[PDB]
Amino acid sequence: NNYDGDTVTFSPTGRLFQVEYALEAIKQGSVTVGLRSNTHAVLVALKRNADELSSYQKKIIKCDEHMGLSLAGLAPDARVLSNYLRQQCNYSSLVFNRKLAVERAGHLLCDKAQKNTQSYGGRPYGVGLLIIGYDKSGAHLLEFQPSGNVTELYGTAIGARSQGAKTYLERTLDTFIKIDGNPDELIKAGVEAISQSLRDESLTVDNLSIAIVGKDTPFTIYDGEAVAKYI
Amino acid sequence: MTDRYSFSLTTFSPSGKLGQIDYALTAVKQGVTSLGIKATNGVVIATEKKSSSPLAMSETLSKVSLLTPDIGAVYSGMGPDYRVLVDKSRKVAHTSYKRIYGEYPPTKLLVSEVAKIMQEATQSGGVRPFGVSLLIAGHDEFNGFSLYQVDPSGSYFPWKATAIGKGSVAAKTFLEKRWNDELELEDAIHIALLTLKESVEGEFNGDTIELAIIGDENPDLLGYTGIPTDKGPRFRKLTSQEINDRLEAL
Amino acid sequence: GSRRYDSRTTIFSPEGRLYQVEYALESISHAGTAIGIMASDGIVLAAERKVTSTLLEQDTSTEKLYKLNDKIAVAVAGLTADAEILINTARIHAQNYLKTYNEDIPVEILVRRLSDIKQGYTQHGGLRPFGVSFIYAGYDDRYGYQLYTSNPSGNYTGWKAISVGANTSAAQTLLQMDYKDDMKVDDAIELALKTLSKTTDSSALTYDRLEFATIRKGANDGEVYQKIFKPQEIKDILVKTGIT
Amino acid sequence: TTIVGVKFNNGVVIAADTRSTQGPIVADKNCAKLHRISPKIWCAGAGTAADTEAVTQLIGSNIELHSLYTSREPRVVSALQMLKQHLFKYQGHIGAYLIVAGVDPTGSHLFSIHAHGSTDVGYYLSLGSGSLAAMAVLESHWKQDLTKEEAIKLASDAIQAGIWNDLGSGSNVDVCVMEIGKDAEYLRNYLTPNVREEKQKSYKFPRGTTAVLKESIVNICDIQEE
Amino acid sequence: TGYDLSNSVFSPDGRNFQVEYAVKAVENGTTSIGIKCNDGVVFAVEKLITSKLLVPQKNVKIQVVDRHIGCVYSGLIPDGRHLVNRGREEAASFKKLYKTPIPIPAFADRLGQYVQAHTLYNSVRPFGVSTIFGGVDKNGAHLYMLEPSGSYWGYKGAATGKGRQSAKAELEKLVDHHPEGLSAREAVKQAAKIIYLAHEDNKEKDFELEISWCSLSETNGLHKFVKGDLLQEAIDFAQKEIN
Amino acid sequence: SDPSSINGGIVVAMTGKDCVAIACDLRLGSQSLGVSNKFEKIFHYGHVFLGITGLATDVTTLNEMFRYKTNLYKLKEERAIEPETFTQLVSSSLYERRFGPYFVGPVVAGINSKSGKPFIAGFDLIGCIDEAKDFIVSGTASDQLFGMCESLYEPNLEPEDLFETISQALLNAADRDALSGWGAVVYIIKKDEVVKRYLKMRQD
Amino acid sequence: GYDRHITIFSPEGRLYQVEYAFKATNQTNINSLAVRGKDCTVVISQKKVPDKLLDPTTVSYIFCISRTIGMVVNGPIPDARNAALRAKAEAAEFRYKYGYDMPCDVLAKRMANLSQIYTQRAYMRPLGVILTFVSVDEELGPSIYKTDPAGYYVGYKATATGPKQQEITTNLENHFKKSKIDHINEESWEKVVEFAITHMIDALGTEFSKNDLEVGVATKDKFFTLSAENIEERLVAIAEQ
Amino acid sequence: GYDRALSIFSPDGHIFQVEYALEAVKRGTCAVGVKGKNCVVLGCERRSTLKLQDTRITPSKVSKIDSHVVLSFSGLNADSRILIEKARVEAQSHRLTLEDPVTVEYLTRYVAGVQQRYTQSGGVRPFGVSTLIAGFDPRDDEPKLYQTEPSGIYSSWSAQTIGRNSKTVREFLEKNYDRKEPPATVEECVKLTVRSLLEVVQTGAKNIEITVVKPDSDIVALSSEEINQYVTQIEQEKQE
Ligand SMILES: [Cl-]
Ligand SMILES: [Mg+2]
Ligand SMILES: [Mg+2]
Ligand SMILES: [Mg+2]
């Protein structure tokens, strides 16, 4: 109200409204799902078009051979944060000959977002991210909020109508965590999860975007006729 | 962090007034009275030592300050602002003059440097004006004895005699009746003590009054002998006893 | 953060005016009147000190008329402290030019430089403008005797006769009435003092309330002399012209 | 250059010769090498003459401001600390070699200082090209508990040794005495043992001896009125 | 009014309202505690299980500084991480110049001065965390708690977050009933109980317990997390006391 | 190669009874090649006179610099600078270039307008002041000038006698220096009249 | 009304942010007192530990700035420690640059100048503290110099700070009106501490245990604080006459 | 440094500081540009509220940027000096690096670029100036006339006017200027330019300035009497 003019101002109840407004941009964004087993981790994303002449906005970005994310909210902010992750993954490989741990990648994203919430002149990031990866401790899934909060999960969803997919994953928890050594079935579970968030529209060949990383699987993105198999 | 106040805090209002300067002058008006009188063979500056507490040692608080051996200063208004201005004035006398010409600046040019500092606090980013008016008395070879007033705006004017602060309006009228161009230094001190008594409520003695002169060279205060051309400072602060001696002939 | 307290000194009004410039001009209209008159054989600068005192040391006092170099002088109307900042800058510019080209700076080049400095404070930096208007009286071998004025906007113009400060509307009408092109310095001295005598807000015009200066080729042969009048000399010229 | 410093009962004395040179040529025959840092802190300089003069005035200026800031009379240890840190920063490129002496509320002090920034304490010190000649005299006649009169005598004798035996030193002896509870007394040309004898001949010329091409009056006055 | 719109502005009371609003964010956070024992310190924190999809034991909250200091905080988690990052820089520079690991009181002031600096200007926001931290140095065990204002003191026991009143009362009983002191193993058990008891203010969702400790005898003065059998033993002791 | 002897030239100054004199040669050269016989090395700012020897570009630069500074001095002080004060200004200005100096040998001469006292001073390239009572010398024939002045000089010479002494000191010193000569000027300075005289000398 | 938020002049020529910083000074509800002996300077301050969970040994508002200078603070602890760290840094730098120990009055002036800057520069707020510096100066002898948020400072024969400063001030005034000297005419610092505690008891009308007080003592070449047991010995002597 | 964003968008998609800069141009004295078949003429209004002016030394309204290009303006006089100086520096820089003087279009594009920059840079306000830039490209005999404004947009014009009452003189030019047959001579072009100003000026005395630019760096300013002869001939034809 009187306390939402900038990110440097607490409200009388201790809230940061500019951060909360940045969180609101994610809720307007298109739905994207993340889930994992013990061998693989999967991203599924519903891409959004402007109209029938337009392309469908890309949602998934590769950060390294073993790591990548999906976005929901301001796309240019995802480009800035994913570029930073690419650099940090790269610094780890060049200097230490070491693949960057997914948990450490989450810590770095948290700290970068935090600086934009405590200083004058700046603004919070207006995007949410789902980071999947396979490192020395197996498969991982992270959820990033531009408040700075990063959380490690078995599965989750962000964007508009993400609550339907999140409840489905909460039911299926015991089933999909056991899908080891079967990439196709893990993606099926993710496609079935994101379907619980659709209304009026359904998953078409240029609508659906899928990514996977695992034990002997580099981070790869599937679009176009490569996802017709799962429709 | 970083100072993000890079804009002026003093600006013109629709009527053409610079509000912050006017308000600074109001702070000066509330300040304790100080005065200055110029004689043929000297200058006197004086003020009241308004002690904040009787447990305070008012000798440790100097309202009248030596700037150079031949230049002294007194103020009315905010004490802390004055103290830092004295520090800056002492330094600028060296950096912008003595380290260049090998001699102390003439009164008018040191006044000019202090004025410049006060002007900049009226235009620079993220600062308020100084809440003081200064009276600066001094002597130099080619200009003789002189007395200057410097205001928060940075404006300065030369005076034969004047007063600033609390009871300045009444004090200036008192000085107009008594001042002439034939006054000796002792006559000016006498008039200074008479003028200052009117604006003082409580005790009026050498311990509650601060008074200094710009007069003859004091070889006894030089600290060394052997150089004929060096004859000592013309600035001298009168002692408590010296003031009381002149209060009996009052 | 800090934005809250920013007055924004360098913005346009909806009408396309610069707020701070306009308000600075309002300030200058309360300053003592300064007049400049240009003749064929010299220039006159006359200016009124603001309500003085009998205890003011006049013979060592200077608030209106300042020397920039041996050929150029200025009359000030506005904040004296602001003026001295600009005056010192102008003195340095004149010396920079003399060092670079080994010739005295042409009057207009000095005027343009100071005016550009004033302009900058209206377009960038977020600082308040200088509350000063100048009358420049000067001589060079290209255009001869010249009069200019500059104001807080940084705009400058040339004049045969001009006033700044208080009552400029009344003063300019009186000058426009009695000024002629073939006029001489001694006639211009009289016009300047007569104009101040009629426009002044004081009861009478006396020597202790005036500053006076002439720039003459009344210097022995092809050279120019600046004369800042002493208090006694202002008293004499007041008697000569029949004002006291 | 020969400069010395000698401690005594109730203070300290410094002395110096008065010859400044440019290679083998004597530039000034009556040079002043005793400098004032503050009323009762004096120093003498050897080495690059402009550096000793400049570093003395800079520290002297800052010492004066410090004295005004603290409402205390300046201390020799302050002058020493400020001098050595300034000289160390410039890694010897400022060629100032100084003997610093004075009195202050703490007592009487005598130090020396070398261009690279190293300092020394002593009861007797010497610096410059004539320092070995001077130190020979000091090592022969110095004792503990010297009187004021004995210290002045010893100091000037040490400078004389430099004057007569070192080609870099000559002319006169300057002295400055700093006693506790007293004004420092600067004794310029305390000894004058090198006055030139009368010449055999006068070399005043008859008027009109020099051939002249042109004469003209130089205008030193400003542009005139009327 | 308007005194509460900008940081570093004194109100007519002499208060900094922006700092007081930061405290509200701290009071909104989960419960965290600290217990000073005979030869060390124990830290514990309540972790709310928002969903079944949270991987157990993975989202670690307690943070180590150097190798001998533990830090836990309640409020805005990112703000706490920013403070610990600074603390790690401070500890590194201290050890670089002075060789010895930073003493706990020395470390306390480093955090204190940094947090206090964020109350001096309107261009920055105060920290939205209260931090409980400490460890073992050459003079023994030390426990500290640091507020958004920059204020910190030494403690026998400390608590912050939504269930701080409950926790404080429990800590006060331990101080009274043990003037001679508490052992490190006892303090771990007691820390488990207090978090379980303080979870009544957050009873809607279930939680996960996280404990760490530094002890001269039990951990050689190094900060370690309580894991496996010793953690389960503390959970059992806690569950027995609430029933 | 040595910057102080590329162009050549000399300056000498002397005191007399209620007067001072300053003189210089007129040569500018490029080592062996004579380039100009009208390169005057004495300048004045009000009643204070300054001679400068050494690298000619620096001679010109410093004149322009001290004209600059004495003009600002006058505007602010409302009086002409005095010899004692100007001497300190020269010293200050030279020392500010301590580690990249002007390769010059300045000489100040003048009479204090208030005390009437005759004043002369000399400097090294880096600012050290030589305040002699008798005479000051500078330039590529400074050794020769020291020899002439030491024997020819006596105190309290009348203006017209001082002219002969300083003229003969310059002329004979210059004739023993390859890089000096090609004309000469002598200034005789009294409290309110200054006379300038060009001397006839050999042109080799 | 933004002239109340930053340090610019109000129409009355006042600085409200400075005035409100003076009010923050009394937020701790603690009173302090300082007096001078023949050879020493003593400062006492109330100690209040309201929480049983606190370690009482870490609760302090007296600071050892240098070997010779001590400082007691009236105001919140964050601003107190800010001022303490700076004073320590300034004192150490002074000794390095000028070769002798920073005098008490000079440090007070320096901290007062820093405070003055916060009243003139907008981006910096005043510190809500009053700083009382004590020492036995090698030139001036026993010294008390006190600084406030306005940038004001002065020397004192004796002084008091806190919510009940006036009661203590008047009590001290009345004693020095009797004795007609500028100090406590006593040889040992122990008896000067006893004088200080006695006159605080008289002025406030409250009794003190060993844990209710905090004491600092300055002698030639060192400033030190007393332990609880040292204070207890002081309290016992007061009660026994 | 002062970084405040003074030029920003409003809810309706307007940048008010740029639009208010145009209002300053509206207040400025009228300026007009007309190109003939082999010349360009720049006319300028002088407000007669200021007499006792020294016309020898007073800043003239038309400024040479190079020997072949000129610039006139309407709006803040002080602001225009900054644009003129920058343009003059760029003209010499272009000659130095390209070894060819600027084209009129290039010089216009530069000045317009400077104006645009001041509409999305922090801590600065837009120029309260619109300009008319005229001349001939090197070794070219085709007349050139361009206009710039505070926003930074620029374009070429057969004839154009800016400043106060420019709506009126543009009305005149739109009905009197034929594109198929532009003013064939210098006389015809100057006559049409003086005629256009007489719709707005007041007295045809010292209120009208005229500058003629021809190919190959041939630039001259007409005097009072020369312009007065055009003023005389125009009204004597009008009395009919
Ligand atoms: Cl300071
Ligand atoms: Mg020869
Ligand atoms: Mg030859
Ligand atoms: Mg402030």
From Swiss-Prot, chain C:
Location of this chain's protein in the cell: Cytoplasm; Nucleus
Entry annotated with the keyword Acetylation: no
Matches recorded under InterPro entries: Ntn_hydrolases_N, Proteasome_alpha, Proteasome_alpha-type, Proteasome_asu_N, Proteasome_bsu_CS, Proteasome_sua/b
One Pfam family linked to the record: Proteasome
Glycyl lysine isopeptide (Lys-Gly) (interchain with G-Cter in ubiquitin) crosslink site(s): 99, 198, 230
Chain segments annotated as transmembrane: none
Predominant cellular place of this UniProt entry's protein: cytoplasm
Keyword Electron transport appears in the UniProt entry: no
Residues making up the signal peptide according to the UniProt record: none
GO cellular component: cytosol; nucleus; proteasome complex; proteasome core complex, alpha-subunit complex; proteasome storage granule
CDD domains, per database record: proteasome_alpha_type_4
Assigned keywords, A-Z: Cytoplasm, Isopeptide bond, Nucleus, Proteasome, Ubl conjugation
PROSITE patterns for the chain: PROTEASOME_ALPHA_1, PROTEASOME_ALPHA_2
GO terms under biological process: proteasomal ubiquitin-independent protein catabolic process; proteasome core complex assembly; proteasome-mediated ubiquitin-dependent protein catabolic process
Note: Present with 17100 molecules/cell in log phase SD medium.
Assigned protein family: Belongs to the peptidase T1A family.
SUBUNIT field: The 26S proteasome consists of a 20S proteasome core and two 19S regulatory subunits. The 20S proteasome core is composed of 28 subunits that are arranged in four stacked rings, resulting in a barrel-shaped structure. The two end rings are each formed by seven alpha subunits, and the two central rings are each formed by seven beta subunits. The catalytic chamber with the active sites is on the inside of the barrel.
Protein name stated in the entry: Proteasome subunit alpha type-3
UniProt source species: Saccharomyces cerevisiae (strain ATCC 204508 / S288c)
Highest classification ranks of the organism: Eukaryota, Fungi, Dikarya, Ascomycota, Saccharomycotina
Gene encoding the protein: PRE9
UniProtKB/Swiss-Prot annotation, chain E:
Coiled coil: none
Keyword Nuclease belongs to the record: no
Superkingdom in the source lineage: Eukaryota
Subcellular location: Cytoplasm; Nucleus
Keywords: Acetylation, Cytoplasm, Nucleus, Proteasome
GO CC list: nucleus; proteasome complex; proteasome core complex, alpha-subunit complex; proteasome storage granule
Family statement: Belongs to the peptidase T1A family.
More details: Present with 12000 molecules/cell in log phase SD medium.
Cited function: The proteasome degrades poly-ubiquitinated proteins in the cytoplasm and in the nucleus. It is essential for the regulated turnover of proteins and for the removal of misfolded proteins. The proteasome is a multicatalytic proteinase complex that is characterized by its ability to cleave peptides with Arg, Phe, Tyr, Leu, and Glu adjacent to the leaving group at neutral or slightly basic pH. It has an ATP-dependent proteolytic activity.
Full protein name: Probable proteasome subunit alpha type-7
Shown residues in whole-protein numbering: 6 to 248 of 288
Curated annotation (Swiss-Prot), chain G:
Assigned keywords, A-Z: Acetylation, Cytoplasm, Isopeptide bond, Nucleus, Phosphoprotein, Proteasome, Ubl conjugation
Subcellular location: Cytoplasm; Nucleus
Cross-link position per record: Glycyl lysine isopeptide (Lys-Gly) (interchain with G-Cter in ubiquitin): 222
Role, per record: The proteasome degrades poly-ubiquitinated proteins in the cytoplasm and in the nucleus. It is essential for the regulated turnover of proteins and for the removal of misfolded proteins. The proteasome is a multicatalytic proteinase complex that is characterized by its ability to cleave peptides with Arg, Phe, Tyr, Leu, and Glu adjacent to the leaving group at neutral or slightly basic pH. It has an ATP-dependent proteolytic activity.
UniProt family annotation: Belongs to the peptidase T1A family.
PANTHER family per record: PROTEASOME SUBUNIT ALPHA/BETA
Name used for this protein in its record: Proteasome subunit alpha type-1
Species for this entry: Saccharomyces cerevisiae (strain ATCC 204508 / S288c) (Baker's yeast)
Curated annotation (Swiss-Prot), chain H:
Main location: cytoplasm
SUPFAM superfamilies per the UniProt record, alphabetical: N-terminal nucleophile aminohydrolases (Ntn hydrolases)
A Pfam family assignment: Proteasome_A_N
Phosphoprotein listed as a keyword: yes
Keyword line: Cytoplasm, Nucleus, Phosphoprotein, Proteasome
Modified residues (Phosphothreonine): 58
One cellular component term from this protein's GO annotations in UniProt: proteasome complex
Localization of this protein: Cytoplasm; Nucleus
One GO process term, biological-process aspect: proteasomal ubiquitin-independent protein catabolic process
Keyword Metal-binding: no
Subunit record text: The 26S proteasome consists of a 20S proteasome core and two 19S regulatory subunits. The 20S proteasome core is composed of 28 subunits that are arranged in four stacked rings, resulting in a barrel-shaped structure. The two end rings are each formed by seven alpha subunits, and the two central rings are each formed by seven beta subunits. The catalytic chamber with the active sites is on the inside of the barrel. Interacts with CIC1.
Comment field (misc): Present with 16800 molecules/cell in log phase SD medium.
Role description: The proteasome degrades poly-ubiquitinated proteins in the cytoplasm and in the nucleus. It is essential for the regulated turnover of proteins and for the removal of misfolded proteins. The proteasome is a multicatalytic proteinase complex that is characterized by its ability to cleave peptides with Arg, Phe, Tyr, Leu, and Glu adjacent to the leaving group at neutral or slightly basic pH. It has an ATP-dependent proteolytic activity.
Family assignment from sequence similarity: Belongs to the peptidase T1A family.
Protein name as annotated: Proteasome subunit alpha type-4
Encoding gene, per UniProt annotation: PRE6
